[PDB]
Structure formats: structure tokens, C-alpha cells
Design a protein around this ligand. Sequence first.
Ligand code: ARB
Ligand code: ARB
Ligand code: ARB
Ligand code: ARB
Lengths: 435, 430, 431, 432
Amino acid sequence: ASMHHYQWAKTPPMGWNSWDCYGASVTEDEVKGNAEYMAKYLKPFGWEYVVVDIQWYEPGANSSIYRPFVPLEMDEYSRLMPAVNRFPSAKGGKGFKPLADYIHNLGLKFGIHIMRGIPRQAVHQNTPILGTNVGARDIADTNSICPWNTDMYGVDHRKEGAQAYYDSLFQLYAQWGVDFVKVADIVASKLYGTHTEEIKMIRKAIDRCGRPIVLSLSPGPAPLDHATLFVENANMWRMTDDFWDRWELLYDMFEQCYKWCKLVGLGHWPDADMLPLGHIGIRSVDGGGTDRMTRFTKDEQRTMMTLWIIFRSPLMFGGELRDNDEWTLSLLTNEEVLHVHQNGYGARQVYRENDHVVWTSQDAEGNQFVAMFNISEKRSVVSVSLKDLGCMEPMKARDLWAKEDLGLVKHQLAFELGPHQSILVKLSPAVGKGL
Amino acid sequence: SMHHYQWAKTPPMGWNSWDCYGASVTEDEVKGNAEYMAKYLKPFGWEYVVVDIQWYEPGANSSIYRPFVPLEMDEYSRLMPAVNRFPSAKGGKGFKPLADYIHNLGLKFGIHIMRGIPRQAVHQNTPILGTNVGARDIADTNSICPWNTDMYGVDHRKEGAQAYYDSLFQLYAQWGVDFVKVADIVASKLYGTHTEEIKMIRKAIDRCGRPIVLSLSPGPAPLDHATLFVENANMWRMTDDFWDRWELLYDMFEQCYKWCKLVGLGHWPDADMLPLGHIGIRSVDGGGTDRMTRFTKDEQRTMMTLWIIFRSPLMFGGELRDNDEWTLSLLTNEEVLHVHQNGYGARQVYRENDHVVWTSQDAEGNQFVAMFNISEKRSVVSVSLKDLGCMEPMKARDLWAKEDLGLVKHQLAFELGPHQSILVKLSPAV
Amino acid sequence: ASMHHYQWAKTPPMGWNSWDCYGASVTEDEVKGNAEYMAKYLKPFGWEYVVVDIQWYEPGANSSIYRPFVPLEMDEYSRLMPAVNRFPSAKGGKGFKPLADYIHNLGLKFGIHIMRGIPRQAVHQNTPILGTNVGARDIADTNSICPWNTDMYGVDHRKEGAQAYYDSLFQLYAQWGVDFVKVADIVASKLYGTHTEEIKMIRKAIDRCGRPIVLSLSPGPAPLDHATLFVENANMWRMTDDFWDRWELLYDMFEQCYKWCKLVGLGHWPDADMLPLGHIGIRSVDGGGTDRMTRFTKDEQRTMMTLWIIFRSPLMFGGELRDNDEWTLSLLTNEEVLHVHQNGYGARQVYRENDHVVWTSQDAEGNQFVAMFNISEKRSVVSVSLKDLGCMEPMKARDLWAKEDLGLVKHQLAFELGPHQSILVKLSPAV
Amino acid sequence: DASMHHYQWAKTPPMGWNSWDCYGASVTEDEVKGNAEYMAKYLKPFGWEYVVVDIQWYEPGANSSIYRPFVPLEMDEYSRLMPAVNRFPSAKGGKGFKPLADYIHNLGLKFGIHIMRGIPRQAVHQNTPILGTNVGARDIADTNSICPWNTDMYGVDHRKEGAQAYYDSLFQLYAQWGVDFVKVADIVASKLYGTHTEEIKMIRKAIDRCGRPIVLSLSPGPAPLDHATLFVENANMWRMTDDFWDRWELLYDMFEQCYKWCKLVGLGHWPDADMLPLGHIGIRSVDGGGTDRMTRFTKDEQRTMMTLWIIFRSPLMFGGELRDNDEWTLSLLTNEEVLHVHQNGYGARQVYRENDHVVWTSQDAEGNQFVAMFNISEKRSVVSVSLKDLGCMEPMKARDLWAKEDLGLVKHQLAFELGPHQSILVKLSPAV
Ligand SMILES: O[C@@H]1[C@@H](O)[C@@H](O)OC[C@@H]1O
Ligand SMILES: O[C@@H]1[C@@H](O)[C@@H](O)OC[C@@H]1O
Ligand SMILES: O[C@@H]1[C@@H](O)[C@@H](O)OC[C@@H]1O
Ligand SMILES: O[C@@H]1[C@@H](O)[C@@H](O)OC[C@@H]1O
């Protein structure tokens, strides 16, 4: 806790993100619909961020597939702005402030996605930059683009006015009341790898703007080689390329959790990415799917929530919330599970063998959480000894998702679990307590 | 197999404005180099007058590009000469008048292009001749050149892509272009070799109805694409940009070794331009500025000798009009040039202790031997006749010196200083 | 004609190799049976080399899977020798000379495989090298092994005794009467790439032994980066990792031939590898198979022979020859087809599109050969215009495998071809 | 991090002496004993306790840092390398290192050895037994795993029956001898195979099964961050870098490696900046581009290195021949005030790095703040840092720890003119 911005995400951010349901193309009405649902059914459980994902500045976006080289909505200072057809309250140069105001009044927080860099249409016209006389063209990198989106060019920190530009972006965002930015094309790039210098300029720009804004970075895989950079400069960073509702990616996440578990801490959260639950693909064609309810089975959905919960990943719901059924809503409203996310710490892989995995973490009151997973293709008993958990005596055991006491455990936990199925258990002391 | 081979039966010889003028050569500088060539060089085979990169960039002024600037372009997305630097191009005539002039001097004309389609055309979605699709419809979304900002790559799968490239070589053919040096096409730090654009270019050339020699740059060309190059291009750069630095000339020896088996009629691995004479007038590359080549006279000869015996294309990179007599002599020795024009089979006989020997032959029995001391120490460099495949004594002649040397019984051997070479002809003794 | 050793392989070497049929484990009697069949049925068609493949020095070899870290027969100069149990004529220190004599007396030539380097056991025991007084241990490389075979360590050309050792190997092989050597762990290596310095040492050693020994390098893929080295130093070098009777490997060879076609020439032959035809996998387990007749369909077997013929690959039969049926023998003995391999030149890919591929070559007699291939998964017409072939008027066309005149062709060649099916056509001037 | 019982074996970063930088592969028993005695006498009160015999104690002809390849090695009947009795006479009679370690334990010190990953090639070639089993060394060897810079072993294949039994047997031996520390080589970086993760785990388990506390050190680096979890959970120490030597370029480079590794430092699991080339080194080593010599590090460089290792909390393993130290060299090892930062400091972080100026800070439980300030440029210059940037909320007492000299009150910032390659180590405490 050396870095002031850690205090802005004491626990891992929880919220909703338009990407998995709406792709690049979410409207004001949809945002607000999801915000209202959150306010009323989710906010008591920690869910507070409402994040407008990529390309809110792209008036014609209608998918997860971007329309390349198209005109973007922009101000007179080379800054992108919301598309007024999609966000009508943005009329009159108001930007996202009205939307942000309405979200804040719900008791909720406001987020946006930005692309690293400065828009290409700005560099080519050479539009001005607020606060300086250099123009957009003079701060652009001559060899730095995003391989999967044509909207921007990279900015070169070595040029006069580079920081001025980033500063000016975060002044705008701060005026609008943004509480959370998800930066893209910054951690992993086929072409260039991690854009470290822009991460630094962005941390600087946030710090200078005077409003607390949580910094999320994307896409992954984040290299461990930049662990220290990430831990000191970002509140979240994506461990993985885009996550979707396919078992192979959920399977894969276990190793990434294992590789990143030691960097997890207050204010600096490796990110397992958004939860493809409920109603997705409405205007997204990504993940090899279209308009659907998540292809994860119920066991898969639990398995994911359980891992993300115990690991302390940010939780960003990715479905259209208003179409949650009760099952889906139950995944988000169980306070006993969420305690593991909010107050747990120390999470670690106890072991992984024959596609059985066990993680454990604890709280400050001496409860110990254990998450046990069968990530194989067959039904099998998964178990762990109390000794391997560091429990030197017998313990009471409770199934947190079912909310049901399991009684006393003297030597080990052991459960028959179908393929892709898990269980999350709380262990609490038996010795020196009532009956 | 390939008809375009007949367009470069011997390796191209010429002049190129890059090393002396960077991106910024004027119509006057070109005219004057061409006039010097017609007068002093044409009899020895020098014929291409190549206008290098960025003739379409009115502001160009160095070897360092001005990025993201507007460029001169027609109404079908095709770049055009900058009228300020090329006054004869006024009124949409492009390069036809300069080329005409050059043709009327008995010479050929070439230009440099960048792979792809101008970024400004894609941004503005300007038309493509012969189609209803626009520039933006044929562009690659993830293809740029890492060291220049002018273009986006073209995506051969899009409708209209080949039409675009066709339309460029229609324009070049209207102008009378005889030679095109394509850039950002062979090696790319980001993407490697742009294979599919090499094929569209080949095809656009073939369809335009005029013989246009195809040169590919920058290198290093990968040996992995040897077939593609041999079959599609007349010349291809073995190396990133060559300059007047010993280390780069030293390095070329291995590259020539590496490529020697793909050298052949119509298809020439290219050791790049000759940074001789007066260079860096408006170029700042190679770690130098306005200067005469930093190669010593020995180094110049060593270079000329390797490029000659290997059969690299020869593109003089200095401002010819500032040649002194030494420099002119390197270009006007017929005996040496015969080795380039009519030699074949060049091969490295050996390389050992930074002594190197190359050999080639003509069809009339003559054997050429180039002997090189690329070490830092004076020494005798020798080679046996037997290792050259000569089974009895021969006569030797020093081709640069034009002097007979006498009978060689067993070995050719000379004292050579560091960086110094000799080129010898052997033929039957009396 | 710059390298004298080019004249040892003026046309692409043709023969039989024990690997595909017997793995590491062939016996003398098996070699002899194959050589007898070759002498009787194949020799006049050009087939002449009888090549004993890897580990003739490993008495317990029994498959294509090597027995690691086991003892190896060796002489008193650190040189591997044949296992007398498998090669009984080698009894009493005679090595392969008696078996080489037998094969020479059938009118045939004799080949062996060797592993690059010097035996590990020789380095550990520090046994002697002939012609010098450093031991084996002093010439070994300290960081060079084969990732897939444990027999040897690499030899370090910077050490005194290194060339002496390679020289001694080729003295022995020449004493034996070896005419061909296939060297392994030398072209491609997952750990180290191409072993160029050993290639040079072996070239020199062959040149010094005073017998023509054709030099074959393996396994691939050969990098184009070393094309000059290969061209000047070897008579054949493998374009590919080990080839087997699997359609996918056959599909993949089309590209490799394209990539190497400009280096094919007299004495220096890019090698598409041994032909997995007939009865293979008797004591081999490679290629995903066991004891079998080739899993290539007849169409695939024709496709392979067609490509290898026109491209001018060496032709090394990998099956047990005595189990050839008539069909299989016919693949090896079509005079008209062999003409393209023996007397053609200039092979090139005319095009490759939607998995249809056309190759062409010619002889000096006026004849142009065109090999047309459907390498797609569906029946389709494959075609090419006389013009794309560089043919300026009507030509008589003949199917070479079928030996059947197809008549006059005025504009193009066009054939319905099954998936994986091919045709080989000669075009000649209209009567 | 607190999960693993072996963390308790290295609560502070191991401190000791290692034979590599002074004697290569070639140290004798008398040299080990001499350095041990020196340690017991002059250094043990400041935390120095490990006496580590480096590589190739089993190679009787060894004579340098350059290995003699493919040579027969001293080995028991169970495929386990044994001390060369010519170099370690007290090992005569199959006693191995027990006598030597007993000697060192009696000085109140701890004993360390170096091992190469794997099983000896000669064991595999002869197919010598694996203790406690009916399998042979040949049955457990990998057929494609070697060290690119040493020929002594083949890798062990964890999937083979007996593989774990072999490693268990090694650590039974080492425990019998009384070994307290093992430096394992050819395990973290390999130009040919990368990190040998499965052998790391076999070794962890063998140690856990042997019944004695044995500190696990891994080498050589660079250790990839990609395996940070593995190293943190399985080892007490792991090399950040390839072998470190008395050259400035290598010292300069370590600054970035510490920056990269600083979040994985913690009780029981210490990223290692490698042994300290101080004093008399290169006596039977030819590595580092040097020969027999006193270290080529200037005093400033020596301090700069001590200071970064101190504040970062790298283990400290002296690589010179201790009996030849001067008072200067000794003074680097005996300053309690500096060592408190290594022993009791935590949270070490780079405050910033700019124009070859670097500042690190850490703190202790008493709210002292330690700050190390480095000029790693080629120019003399003033290096500074604000107390705001140190997160010191108000004015502070300052003290130069190496000089042991109060600097008085500091209100706004620390600033010092430092030579090139020169550093200072300061402690800030609350005022009055
Ligand atoms: O979730 C994805 C993310 O990886 C980003 O970089 O680009 C678009 C979406 O926001
Ligand atoms: O000679 C250089 C060449 O390498 C090319 O690629 O770019 C511009 C110049 O023409
Ligand atoms: O044909 C294979 C070959 O590729 C070689 O490298 O080793 C074994 C067989 O001889
Ligand atoms: O210190 C070096 C170390 O890096 C090891 O890997 O090899 C021998 C020495 O102990």
C-alpha cells in the first residue's frame, strides 16, 4: 500500500460491462436499463460499476466486428466523444456527464473503455491538442497501431505534447464524472507487446486529474515479466485474451490464476475477465456464438464464479442483466460466497493433479475457504487433507453456495464431483466453540 | 519459363537518387544525372535513371520522412509526381515528359514505389479505376510499413485489389516507366515478406503491356522465399540498406555466398546501390552527411569487384556530375564489366582467415578470379589452379589495371593489403 | 560441374533403404534378399543402391524405437562396426566388406547410414582415434547431441583430431566398399539446427578417402538458408522430416518441392525421402502404423511417384521388395515415366490454386512433361492452357502411366481427377 | 507469503560464503575449513552462517572454473555422487561430508553443497542401482535432457518409476551428512530446455521427506517471471541473473532485475542477486574475464552493490577467500546498522529511476524508513528524492548508515552529490 490509487479499489471492482452482450454498439437506453437493474437487485452485494465498453465514439457500430477506417465522433481537441445517436443525452457537447450523473444518482459508478493512443483522423488532419500548440500529428508514433482495430495510433511519450494529450483526456473524463477506465490495446499486442510507456503516461494523467479513476488494462495475456509495472500502475490487468463461454477457456484460466496468485493484493487485481453469463451475443458475434444464454452449464457457471471469487478477480458481469433468470441472479446475490472475494486473502493453489484442483484462502477471523474443482472429463472424488490446508485440528465445514452446514471434518474434505463441477467450502474452528 | 526474364538478360545498370538526395530529388537533378550517364556511361551499359522514394511528397527534404503528410494523388487513388520538384508534371502529365527526355537520351527510366495504397486514399475513400469499389474497401486493416507512413497494405482477397495494382502499372506504362523498385515488400520487422502483394504486382506488370523490370526492397530477403523471388522479380535485395561503411561491405561476402545459386538470367539477387562519389547531399542515412564516399579506394574496388563477379545489379548512388576521374574509372572499365555481363557460375572457392576467393567464367574459356583480403592484416592471398579447376598453367591478366601478369604455373598469389582485392583473368598459355 | 563429387550422382540416386520396412534392425539376409530382387527386376531400370539404414552397429536393435544408452559394437579406434549377430559375414573384423562384395557382384552399389559424430561410449572411455594421439574424449563437443538418439556426441571441428576421426571413418567405409552414405542428425535438429561444420568435415573426409561415396543428408526439414552449403557439399539432402504413408505428409511435400526446385541439378538433389510403398512396418512402428501394406491408395501412390519423378527426387524404395505385387512393381518400371526423371530438367510449378497443382519439365528432345494433381478433398477437373505451359501451337498428348495416346490438343489439357489423384502427360510437336 | 513449512528455514535471507568465485570447481577441505574458521571468528555475530562447497566436489581432478568434460566422477553404488577424497581427506572411508559438516556445525555454522540437476551420465551408462528399488539409473534418465554447460549428468524423468526414489535417496544422503543448504544448478535457466519444473518439484519433495531442514537455492538464472509462483512456493532462493561477476555492466544490470522481482521477495523465498565478488577471487577461477585478483569493483561500486543487495534483501554469499580480506572488505560485512535493513526491512521498492538515477526504499516495524540512493550514470551528480515520494508525512531525522553519522533533520527532501557508480544508504526516523 505505497501507491495512493490502490485505495480506489480496496476490494476487486464489481460491475457490469456492455462488451459481451452488445459488442461495440451499446446504446444509452441499454446502459441505463442495466444500471437500474443493478441499483435495485445487486448494489447491496457490492456490484457498483457500470462500464460502457469499446467504441462509444463510433456512431455506426453494430457488432463486435469493428467498421474500419470510419469517421469517429470527436471534439476540437482530438478527443473522442460519445456518439449522439447512441447516447442522445450527449447532445450539445455534454459528453457522458448526463449519463454519468444519472448513474451516480442510482448510487452507482461510471466506467468507460478507451483505446490506447490518439485517433488516426486526428493525426492525419493534425487537429489541435488542448493545452499546447503542438498538434495531434506531432505526438503520434510513426510505428504503432493496434492490430485488431483501426481507430488510433500510439502516442510517443518522448514528444512534447504527448502527456498533455493524455492529461487532457482524463480532464474530460473527470468532468464527465468517470470513475473507471478500461484501456485496450495496451497489455498484449501481437505486433508490439506491452505498451509500457503509455501505461505510465496514463497513470500520470489519472493522478493529475483530481478524480479517483480505477485503471483497468486489456486485453491480455499479461506478461509476468511486467508484474511490477502492472502492480504499481494498474488496479486491474487482464491475464488472458478475451474470455468467452467455452470450457476450454475456463479450463485455461486455472493455470493463469496459478501464475498470477502472488501479485494479487489490495488495489492491484489480476483480472480473469468478464463473466459470460445470462444473455449474451445480442449484438456480438465473438466467442464463436450469436444471440444466446451462456453456453456454460450450471456447473461451469458455478465453477467460474468459484474460481474468480476465491482468486479475487474483478467481477464484471457481461450479460444483459434484465434478462437474468433466477438461477443467474442467484450467482450474484450470495453474500456468503462473496465474503470470500471481499475479505479473503492469501489465495493459493493447494495442488493440481489429474485434473483435480484445490485452492484455499482465509479471512482475518480464522475462517478458511476451500474451493475444490474437478476440471476433468469424468466424475470423481476430489479431496484434500486438513493437514495440507494447514488445519492442525478438526473443523466445521459449510457449503457456501448451497448455504448448508456439512458438519465436522476431522481428517479431510472429500466430495464426489461431476466433470467441470466444483464446490466452495468454509472451514471454521470446532475446538473451543459451542454445540 | 518466365517471359519477364528477357527484360533483364544481364543485371540492371543505372543510377538511383537515394544515396545522394534521399526522398527529395528534383527534376533538374535527375535530368543532369541522366545527361551525364548518356554522355559518359551508356557505352558501358549504364542505362536506368531511377527516381527513388517519395517523388509524390512535395515537402520531402532528407532521407528522414515527414510522417502523415498529404501526398500528391490523382482521382483514382494513385500517387503523382510533386509539381514543385517536377515542374514538367504540371497539368497531370506525371512523369511522361521526364521519361521521354530520358528515353530520347538513349536511356531508361525508373521509379520507386511503396507497397500498398495511400493511407489518405483509404481515409477519404477515393475511387479505384475500373471499378465501383473504393480505396477503403481493398485496404488491409493490419498492414503498414514500419519505417514509412505513406501507405496501407492491399488485401488481395478484396474485390478491386488487383484492379488497383493494375491501374498503377497502367499509369506507369503511360508515363513510359521501364523499371520499378518496390519497397516495404521483402523484409518487414513487423510482417516479413509480403508475398501476395508480390504476386499482384507481377500480374499488374504483365498485364500493362510494357516491359517493366521489377526490383524488390529493402532486404534481407529470406532464402525461404527463393522460388517466389526468382520467379517473380528481376531483382531482390539481399540486405537492408547498404552504405559506405566497411562493416556492411564485409558482411556482403556472406550474403553473396548465401545467394550465389539463385543468380541467373532475368533474376538477380541484389547487393544494393553503390555509395560512391558524392553522397549525402540531402541524406542523413548511414551515419553520415554531405560527403564523398568514406570507402577507401581499396574498399571501392573490393566492392566493385564483388558486385561485378557475383553479378549484382549496379546502381550508382552518387551525384554523377561530381565524379572525379578515379570514380569515373570504376564505371568505364570494359574488361571488368565483361565479367558482370558475360560471366556465369560465380562461386566462393574458399573463405579462410578472412581471405576470400571467388571464381566465374565466360563461355569462351576465360576464367575470372576475384581475390580478397577482408582481414585487417596485409597478407598473401593465394589459390591453386587446381582448386580453380585449371589443370595446367595459364596466363593471367589484371583486369582493373589492364596489364598482363604472365604465366601462372601452380598458384595465383598476390600480396593484398587489408580490405584490398584483385580481379584476374586466366586463359590458356602459349 | 564445379564440385568433382557431382559426377558421382549425375542422375538422382535410385535404390532401396531398410528403414521403412525394418527400422533399426535389418539383418544380412534381409539385405541380401532385397538386393537379389533388385538385381533381378529393377537394376536395368536404374535402381542400384542397397542401403543399410541406422544402427547396424546395435546388436539388440528391434524396431524403429531405439534402445537408449546401450553398448554398441565399435573397433579399437572409436569406430562403429556391424553387429555380427545381425551381419554374420562381418565376423572377424571384416565389417561390411563381404556384404558389399556380394552386392557389387550383383552389379549393385552399397550404402550405409551413419549418425553424425562420435560414440558416447568412446568419449566416456576415451578410446583412441586412428592417425592421432588425442583420444575420442578430446574431440567431442560438450554441448551437442541428437535429441532423438543417444548413440553419439557431436564432434567439434575446432579440436585437433576431429578431422582425423572423420577421415578414419571414410577410410573404413572405402575399405568396405561403401558407395553411398546417409548421414543423420545433421540437417535439422530441434535443439541445434544444421550442423554445417560437420557437413564440411564429412565432405573433406569423403574427398580424402579415394573412393566415390555419394553423400545423403537427413533428416529434414532442410533450411533454404543453407542452400549453398547443401548444394556444394551434398549429393542429396532431405527437404522434410521423415516421410510416411499418410496423405497429410504427401500433401505437404508439394510445397517443399516448390521451395527447393531451383536448387535441383546434376549432382545435388533435394530429397523428398524414401518411398513408403509395398510392405512396410515389419519391424518399424513409425508413421502411426504397424506391419502393413502401404496405406496410400493407388491414386496417392501414383501422385507421390509422379511428383517425385518430375521434380527429380532421388528414389529410395522403403518396402520389402520381395513382397511387391504386380501393381507395386509397375510403379518402378514404367520406362516412359522414368525418362522424365532421367532426362527431364527444368521442373517448376506452373501454378497452385484451390488445391489443384500443375508442374512441368522438359527434355532436350522437344518434349514437355506436365504433371497435374488434384490435392483437394473433392473430384474436380484440373486444367492448364498450352499457353501457360509455353506451348505456342497444338501438341500431341500422351498419358505416360497408362502409355496411351490422347490425341492432339489445340488449347489446353483438362482432366477429371479424383481427390488425391494425378496424371502425367507428355506433350510433343504435332505429327 | 506464508503457506509452506520450509519458509521457516529461511526467515531472513541466507547469509554465508560460497567457494565458486575464489576456487571454481576446485576447493579443498582445508580451504573450506579456513573460510569457516574465519567466519566463526569475525562474521558469525553479524548473521553470516552458511559455508557452501560449490560445484563439482565429486570431480577429483577439477582445477578451475572450466570443467573437464566427460571425466569419471566419484560415486557410490547407488548412483550418488560422493566427495573426492583427494580434495576432502576426511571423507576417506565412505564418510562423505559428515566429518566436514560436523566440524562446521561445531563452529556454530551451517553447511552447504552444490548439486547438478539430474543423475550422473556414468550411472546411466553403467546402469547402477537406484537405492531402495529394483530399478536402474538407466530406467529413470531422460533421453533428451542435458546441461548445455556441464557434462556431468542426464536429467531425470519424473514419470519413470524410481525417479522420485533417486532424488529422495540423494537428500537422505545429504541429511545423513548434515547438509543444511543445497544450491541446485541447471534447473532455472537453460539455453536448451528452459526451466526444469518437474525436477524442481521432485527435489522439493525429496527435501520434505528427508526429515532435516535444507534450504533450497536455485541456479543459474535468469529466472523467468513466468514461473514466479513455482519458485516462490518451492524454493528459498532463485537466481535472478546468469553468473554475477565484478564487472560494472553486471552491477548496473541488477537494478532492473531487482525492480522486476521486488514483489516476490518475502519471508522464506528470496530472489537472489547472486554471490558477492569481493576480496580475493579468481584464485582458481578464470570466469568473469579475470584471473587471480582483488575485486575490480571500486569501493563505490562495492558499496553500491552491498547497498542494493541489502535493501532489496538478496541473500548474501561472500565469494572471496575470506582469510585474505583487508579491513575495508571486512567492514562491508560487519556493519549492524546496514544489516538491520536486510534483516528487518520489508516492502523494498524502486521509488523511481531517471537518467541513471535510482532510489529504493523499504521500512521496518518500528516505522524507520530506509532509503538507498544510487547514481548509476557515468557523471557525478546530485540525486534526490522528496519525502512526499517516500510517503513520509512530516520532517524526519536522517542518518548515513554506512558512515554511521547523523545528518540531522530533514523537512522536504533527501539530496546528495554522488560520484558515478556511487550510492548512499540512509535511515529516516521520526523527529525530536
Ligand atoms: O474485452 C475486450 C478487450 O480485450 C479490449 O482490449 O478490446 C475490446 C473489448 O473491450
Ligand atoms: O534503398 C531504400 C530501400 O531499402 C527501400 O526499401 O526504401 C527506400 C530506399 O529506396
Ligand atoms: O530416415 C530416417 C532419417 O530421417 C534419419 O535422420 O534417421 C533415421 C532414418 O534413417
Ligand atoms: O554460480 C554458478 C551457478 O550459476 C551454477 O549454475 O553453476 C556453477 C556455479 O555454482
